[PDB]
Amino acid sequence: MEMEKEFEQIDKSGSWAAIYQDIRHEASDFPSRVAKLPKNKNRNRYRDVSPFDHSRIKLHQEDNDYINASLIKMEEAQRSYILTQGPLPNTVGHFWEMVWEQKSRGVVMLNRVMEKGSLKCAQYWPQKEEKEMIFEDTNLKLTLISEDIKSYYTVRQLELENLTTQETREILHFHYTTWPDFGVPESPASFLNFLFKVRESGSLSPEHGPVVVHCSAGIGRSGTFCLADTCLLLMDKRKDPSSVDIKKVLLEMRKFRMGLIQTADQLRFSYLAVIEGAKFIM
Numbered sequence: 001m002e003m004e005k006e007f008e009q010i011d012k013s014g015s016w017a018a019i020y021q022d023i024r025h026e027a028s029d030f031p032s033r034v035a036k037l038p039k040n041k042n043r044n045r046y047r048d049v050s051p052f053d054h055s056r057i058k059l060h061q062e063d064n065d066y067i068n069a070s071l072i073k074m075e076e077a078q079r080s081y082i083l084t085q086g087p088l089p090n091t092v093g094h095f096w097e098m099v100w101e102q103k104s105r106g107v108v109m110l111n112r113v114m115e116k117g118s119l120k121c122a123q124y125w126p127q128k129e130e131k132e133m134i135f136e137d138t139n140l141k142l143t144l145i146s147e148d149i150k151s152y153y154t155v156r157q158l159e160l161e162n163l164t165t166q167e168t169r170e171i172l173h174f175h176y177t178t179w180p181d182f183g184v185p186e187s188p189a190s191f192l193n194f195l196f197k198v199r200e201s202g203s204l205s206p207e208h209g210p211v212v213v214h215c216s217a218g219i220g221r222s223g224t225f226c227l228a229d230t231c232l233l234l235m236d237k238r239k240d241p242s243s244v245d246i247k248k249v250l251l252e253m254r255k256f257r258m259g260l261i262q263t264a265d266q267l268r269f270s271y272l273a274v275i276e277g278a279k280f281i282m
């Protein structure tokens with residue numbers, strides 16, 4: 001079926017939970033043996049969210065190459081994304097090592113450091129220009145260059161220096177700051193505006209390594225971001241845009257990381273975002 005009318009048909013019939021459970025039943029199951037090794041317990045935020053072995057990002061290190069991060073490679077859309085958990089106190093150095101090694105231009109953050117009164121990720125970037133951060137375990141230096149605070153999101157320019165080679169690179173930090181502590185946003189308008197700002201920066205384009213996107217577990221809000229981006233790109237590429245099937249795209253992405261889209265409300269919000277976004281593109 002088309003999307004907008006499939007949408008109203010699920011609303012009128014109140015069957016979002018049944019649709020979402022079908023997706024959960026059909027989703028791929030692949031091994032994640034490296035994630036579960038005892039030496040990696042303090043590298044995982046949640047025991048039930050792990051990268052598959054076949055798609056995990058490897059650190060260029062011979063001691064321990066593990067990080068909780070996955071490469072989502074979308075062949076028809078010609079887009080790739082790295083989805084990862086919010087960094088932990090003992091993985092902030094690994095996080096920036098990955099950004100460096102994978103040649104990423106942008107980092108997309110969809111959570112606040114504290115939500116619901118608890119810490120959802122480490123404070124992994126500097127908050128003042130004159131107070132830079134040094135990660136001694138991976139030999140990197142990170143400096144805040146500029147910050148632009150808007151009503152729904154903040155954009156930061158960061159300098160990452162590989163202290164071993166003295167090479168430097170400019171990284172863009174796109175921080176969506178207004179996702180509610182509970183539920184999903186009422187309108188997709190500010191989320192779509194944010195997606196378009198990431199796109200306009202070059203961070204999603206083939207001349208760079210894959211964008212790094214995270215929330216707390218790296219599957220819920222993060223899944224919504226890449227699912228909406230890929231669906232809108234396919235609607236632009238194809239002769240028949242009504243042939244884009246958001247459930248089929250989501251199942252394709254779940255071949256590369258488990259659990260993408262965590263609730264039926266997140267599924268409905270993803271439909272809404274693609275539907276509204278397709279009208280603005282034209």
Ligand SMILES: Cn1ncc(Cl)c1C(=O)N1CCCCC1
Nearest residue numbers: 089090092122123124133134135
């Ligand atoms: C300021 N700083 N220098 C190195 C690192 Cl790592 C940090 C940092 O962000 N943290 C928070 C997590 C554990 C303690 C340190």
Ligand SMILES: Cn1ncc(Cl)c1C(=O)N1CCCCC1
Nearest residue numbers: 187188189190192193276277280
């Ligand atoms: C997709 N989009 N781009 C900008 C804005 Cl604003 C929105 C949006 O959600 N709305 C509501 C529906 C009609 C268009 C306005």
